[PDB]
Ligand binder design. Sequence first.
Ligand code: ADP
Ligand code: ADP
Ligand code: MG
Ligand code: MG
Lengths: 309, 309
Amino acid sequence: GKKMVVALGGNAILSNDASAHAQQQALVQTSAYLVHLIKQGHRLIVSHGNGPQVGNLLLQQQAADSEKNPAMPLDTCVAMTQGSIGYWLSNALNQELNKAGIKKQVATVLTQVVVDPADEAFKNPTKPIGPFLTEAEAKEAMQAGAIFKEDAGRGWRKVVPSPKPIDIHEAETINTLIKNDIITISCGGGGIPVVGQELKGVEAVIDKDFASEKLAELVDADALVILTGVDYVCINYGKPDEKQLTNVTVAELEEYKQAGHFAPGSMLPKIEAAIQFVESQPNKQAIITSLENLGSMSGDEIVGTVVTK
Amino acid sequence: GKKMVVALGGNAILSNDASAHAQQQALVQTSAYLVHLIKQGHRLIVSHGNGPQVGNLLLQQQAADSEKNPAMPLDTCVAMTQGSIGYWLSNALNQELNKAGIKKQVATVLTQVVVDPADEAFKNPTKPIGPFLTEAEAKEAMQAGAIFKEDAGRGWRKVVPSPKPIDIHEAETINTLIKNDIITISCGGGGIPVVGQELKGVEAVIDKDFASEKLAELVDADALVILTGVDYVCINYGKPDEKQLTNVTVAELEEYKQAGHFAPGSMLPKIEAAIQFVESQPNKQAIITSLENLGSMSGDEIVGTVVTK
Ligand SMILES: Nc1ncnc2c1ncn2[C@@H]1O[C@H](COP(=O)(O)OP(=O)(O)O)[C@@H](O)[C@H]1O
Ligand SMILES: Nc1ncnc2c1ncn2[C@@H]1O[C@H](COP(=O)(O)OP(=O)(O)O)[C@@H](O)[C@H]1O
Ligand SMILES: [Mg+2]
Ligand SMILES: [Mg+2]
């Protein structure tokens, strides 16, 4: 069996219906697939994204904003989504483990992810968040310290930094749970962004896959498994000559990267994080595939885009 | 030292406004007092309430309620507050620990607290919660069985049950962290209420002190310390003949309780929880006092209303 960090994405909470019940139902389906990994002897360390969840929460912050009910900053909103999604996922996993007759503890740990204040991302925030405000509301926010950028035609929306994760505060706690064979859920939404030894909260968005890769390094995982919306990373994706990548090496991926095969923002971060993990220490593996593709496992072997040195 | 469950209440988050920043600063002050206990060798396992926090979150759920941004049910909102408050408190405690030069890690574990569906509370809900609705809105909201009661002159509110905890799902995980000298924050808001084999969420409010007492039993804590708004519990409270209770036995408290000295909904549950803990096992002590009164500690000994038997 392998100790693996499993980084869930949007596909893990595929529901369309934004209700808690619909998202919980989606996570139960996701958990059924994850339990396949447990049946095969793997030791899971799970993380997840929070795109639509934090997006809706941010809209809720604005809808009721007042002196008595002030909008919560982004870092607190991320913490809230670690709570909601962590609850839904841990609950769903327990259900599916029970259905399989398997006894295994699941626990969600709030996770603060440290970033460098000197990170170039802070001088140049590029992550748009929240609702589209009017120039007026924008200028008012500007005078309030926020950085807004008019999205020509759509309006003005707040932009925040996307810094690199340099450490996971709760890493040792997560390691402790790991060693006690407890399935942990952490780094939700890429983590609650904090800076410095004092762990000062900041409004930023940390890439979930790089946060997961940092966790994988800190807990000395054997593999980083990113589960997304495709069974295999492809070259010429969506094109007539599309080709699925199975076993790949870093040099191969670097060649394809320069040819522009991995869309920025979506697949590119996964490829970069996977390469980084494989380059971090000898005998490390990274896999990019989907939950559904776990049905194609060969024994305890996960198939998909498998990256090695 | 002694393994002690410290149950924080409203005054632990003493802020002049409801902003995240103000509440975080309030928790920093609270953490200063908690560090005092840690310096004295006590092994802390902390819990907290969430009344004002979940209240504002529920108002945010209502403000943007729509098909695309549906209001999250109470159990999910409780999970979200375990995330926000857990983040604020763990971050504040780390800051105060570092200031004291103490190398101790803090971790927040989402907590699902199990209740019995046959609990009398489900037949007679008593906890009003959420927004004040019109009579027409409440009428429609009650068709599926939910109970709404009119608050004359204010509106109609949902009234949920306050069932007793029969288990803390993550208890073993929390104990494992405790055994590894990690300060845990759990049972936030009394816990995410769940029922049955699938741990289905239910809209209810589990008393934070009863939840904390159950945790104290499950982790075999030496003491249950409830920190609230008074330095000492009193009899003839607010009357000219008011008397503060210091060392007191279970028998004495039972007499006082029967005399109606402890207000329902506020002090009564703390007294009942204290009695339950002292009677739960030999060599168990329960204390009810305030964070401020910790400044009057005699060495590693906490003064206040100390229950023994
Ligand atoms: N070369 C490529 N091969 C496969 N999928 C690709 C490629 N380039 C872009 N994609 C897209 O990247 C998506 C996954 O990234 P993203 O949408 O960000 O998902 P997640 O929520 O998992 O982060 C795929 O599901 C696919 O639509
Ligand atoms: N006999 C009593 N002795 C002391 N305090 C009492 C008594 N009866 C009621 N109280 C009130 O109970 C309060 C504590 O319960 P509560 O307000 O719910 O606080 P918390 O947020 O800590 O749960 C006290 O601070 C006090 O205002
Ligand atoms: Mg993505
Ligand atoms: Mg109270």
